């Protein structure tokens, strides 16, 4: 997260870390046994880390649980990043408490101009690198489709939306992928891609979750 703020411990209790001997992506807990992330975060032997704030220190709210299944969207395309969504099943159910809780799926797609909370442990600089210990937070608006498609001509599908600030300074970034965009208590977005981070006229692009709710519920139903 560039130009954001320290969220404060466990103020985002649906946020998880995907770990392979190091944090590489984020995710969102949607029930005790299932997590939502980006398809491009896919890899074998993932450890899901729930209840994290400082990913580099044991603070005593962590549940570390191994992924038992990874289900990439059947029509994910790694070149266009269309259908950049993936479901992860935990090997054992998380213990749901105050600092570890589900986020709700949306009933409807959100609209341009809504403010959302975007969070993760990604980079905080738009030039060079600085990686935080603690979870970062950003309030950002969903952009019109017109401005989205104008920022990235020919690269925005019906399953993506832009969110952020066209003047730069405030964005998601490397390390945030797979993490949540939450608008009025629903998961509307997944950190996916952009050109650079927090660059002028290059907003964050996010997977449009509302398009996927049936497929998510049926996938959970049948696995």
């Amino acid at each position: 997260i560039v130009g954001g703020y320290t969220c404060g411990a466990n103020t985002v209790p649906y946020q998880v870390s995907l770990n392979s001997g190091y944090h590489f992506c984020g995710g969102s807990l949607i029930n005790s046994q299932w997590v939502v992330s980006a398809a491009h975060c896919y890899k074998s032997g993932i450890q899901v880390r729930l209840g994290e704030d400082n990913i580099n220190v044991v603070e005593g709210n962590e549940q570390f649980i191994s992924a038992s299944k990874s289900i990439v969207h059947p029509s994910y395309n790694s070149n266009t990043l269309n259908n950049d969504i993936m479901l992860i099943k935990l090997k054992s159910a998380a213990s749901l408490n105050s600092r570890v809780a589900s986020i709700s799926l949306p009933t409807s797609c959100a609209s341009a101009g809504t403010q959302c909370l975007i969070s993760g442990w990604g980079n905080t600089k738009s030039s060079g690198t600085s990686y935080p210990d603690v979870l970062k937070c950003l309030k950002a608006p969903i952009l019109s489709d017109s401005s989205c498609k104008s920022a990235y001509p020919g690269q925005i599908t019906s399953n993506m939306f832009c969110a952020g600030y066209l003047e730069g300074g405030k964005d998601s970034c490397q390390g945030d992928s797979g993490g949540p965009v939450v608008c009025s208590g629903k998961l509307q977005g997944i950190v996916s891609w952009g050109s650079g981070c927090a660059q002028k006229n290059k907003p964050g692009v996010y997977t449009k979750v509302c398009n996927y709710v049936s497929w998510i519920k049926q996938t959970i139903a049948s696995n």
């Binding site: 190091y22 944090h23 590489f24 992506c25 980006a38 491009h40 975060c41 890899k43 266009t80 990043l81 990604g122 980079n123 990686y131 690269q155 998601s172 970034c173 490397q174 390390g175 945030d176 992928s177 797979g178 950190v191 996916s192 891609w193 952009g194 050109s195 650079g196 981070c197």
Partner: peptide, 12 residues
């Protein structure tokens, strides 16, 4: 199109 995995999409 640069994905936002750490440290990068291409670095893996």
């Amino acid at each position: 199109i640069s994905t936002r995995k750490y440290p990068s999409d291409w670095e893996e």
